Amino acid sequence: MSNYPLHQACMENEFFKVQELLHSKPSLLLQKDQDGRIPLHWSVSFQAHEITSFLLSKMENVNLDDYPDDSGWTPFHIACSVGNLEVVKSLYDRPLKPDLNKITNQGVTCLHLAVGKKWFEVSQFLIENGASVRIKDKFNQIPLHRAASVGSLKLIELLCGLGKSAVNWQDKQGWTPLFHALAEGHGDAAVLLVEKYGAEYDLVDNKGAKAEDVALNEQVKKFFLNNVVDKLAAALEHHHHHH
Incomplete structure (x- = not known):
């Protein structure tokens, strides 16, 4: 310059x-x-x-x-x-x-950035000092969406645990964090969201695809479906939902 x-x-x-x-x-x-x-x-x-x-x-x-x-x-x-x-x-x-919630021209916060880059310490510092974890950028995405996108289990825990973040919020594309996790091939991350944070997996995106349908590949998808209860066979139905 x-x-x-x-x-x-x-x-x-x-x-x-x-x-x-x-x-x-x-x-x-x-x-x-x-x-x-x-x-x-x-x-x-x-x-x-x-x-x-x-x-x-x-x-x-x-x-x-x-x-x-x-x-x-x-x-x-x-x-x-x-x-x-x-x-x-x-x-x-x-x-x-x-x-701490100030946004960029495209609606992203500091926590959105830190989390998208997988900076744990920095993300924790923000959340501990008051940063909100429920602000959606111009894509209706909150940090957790990014956490699931980069496949960071640490970040998912931080956001959903200490952060008490919502888990089933759909973005502009109709995607919940789960969708993002599977699209990027992060099988373990997808299973965590569902198994430990009550992420619903029977939702459909704007095109009609369930999260499992946008899986990066057969193995990723195979691994998901084999570690989340076969609802079709479930005896009872969920007695809680989350949010």
Whole structure:
């Protein structure tokens, strides 16, 4: 990025340079580049811890939420997507706390990002500090959908257990987390949702397919059906449903 030397210096991790720039023209601290990002976005993006900390010390009275880039990403969104818990703690541990549910242009939250990248610590930190687990992006997907999509059992537990997340919410495509788990071939994850978190598997998507029908392959599907009770034969019927 030419015309934005300070943002560039953050990307390269040239801490000394960053300091020289802020001294020659302080006004660059909160300047927005072509993509609407300010210096803090790049330091956090390239995990330049030394620079980030310095930027924050100069942003004493700045609410990170007032700085979403053109994509809707605030520097806090970047931290959580990157996964460095320590940086996330430094961005969050400030007088003006970020709205943990703030969304991107496409309706995704920090927890949506952290979970989609399989960052356990960061996801736990968010959930423990108040982040909601029931916010649906522009696709009507809550984090758990992603957790099932990347096939992370740890994340499913965290969201459904501590997070008390809903399990049978259907997205724009009519998919519940279960569908996502099977579509990606995560057999064990699909069985966990059903066996431990009451995920209903008799629902149909917008095309008429049951979760088992969108299985990645025969084995994945074979493994699901053989570890979830054959409802057709079940003596009784569920006495609880979940949600």
